[PDB]
Amino acid sequence: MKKLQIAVGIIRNENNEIFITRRAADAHMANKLEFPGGKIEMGETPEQAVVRELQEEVGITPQHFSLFEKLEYEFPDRHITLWFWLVERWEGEPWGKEGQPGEWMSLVGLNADDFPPANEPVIAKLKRL
Numbered sequence: 267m268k269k270l271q272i273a274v275g276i277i278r279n280e281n282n283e284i285f286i287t288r289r290a291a292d293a294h295m296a297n298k299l300e301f302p303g304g305k306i307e308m309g310e311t312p313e314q315a316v317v318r319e320l321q322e323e324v325g326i327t328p329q330h331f332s333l334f335e336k337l338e339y340e341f342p343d344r345h346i347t348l349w350f351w352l353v354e355r356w357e358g359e360p361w362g363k364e365g366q367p368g369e370w371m372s373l374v375g376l377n378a379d380d381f382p383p384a385n386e387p388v389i390a391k392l393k394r395l
């Protein structure tokens with residue numbers, strides 16, 4: 267079974283909204299809402315990975331961010347370790363840089379059912395802030 271390390275960014279603005287994209291229909295976890303992010307490559311750190319993935323996917327450089335949660339989740343065909351970084355300062359304005367849907371969503375209104383099941387404890391913990 268494939269084992270992957272994934273770094274994602276919880277991009278939170280001053281109005282308690284999170285920048286959320288929707289995964290492509292032919293991707294793993296197709297059509298799900300997601301925090302922007304992706305695989306940590308050989309030779310790069312989890313911190314470097316979340317910067318690179320947010321630059322690629324939504325056009326921002328996260329700065330002065332912190333590890334909100336790290337967890338492991340066994341999907342039917344792969345095992346993933348997810349690094350959830352809380353990103354409250356960044357350079358740029360996030361957008362659908364890869365042509366993917368992206369929009370600001372109120373934290374209180376997030377529905378964990380809309381995201382991959384691995385995100386359930388993170389979404390709950392975020393609403394506790």
Ligand SMILES: Nc1nc2c([nH]c(=O)n2[C@H]2C[C@H](O)[C@@H](COP(=O)(O)OP(=O)(O)OP(=O)(O)O)O2)c(=O)[nH]1
Pocket residue numbers: 272274293294295299300301302303304305319346348382383384385
């Ligand atoms: N990006 C992201 N992925 C998540 C979340 N929750 C979750 O279980 N995943 C899973 C889905 C995928 O198995 C993996 C994310 O990898 P990815 O498809 O974003 O990888 P990538 O950006 O490097 O790949 P690509 O789009 O360049 O093809 O982690 C999340 O909140 N954000």
Ligand SMILES: [Mg+2]
Pocket residue numbers: 303304305319322323
């Ligand atoms: Mg990516």
Ligand SMILES: [Mg+2]
Pocket residue numbers: 302303304305323
């Ligand atoms: Mg990605």
Ligand SMILES: [Mg+2]
Pocket residue numbers: 304305319
């Ligand atoms: Mg990638």
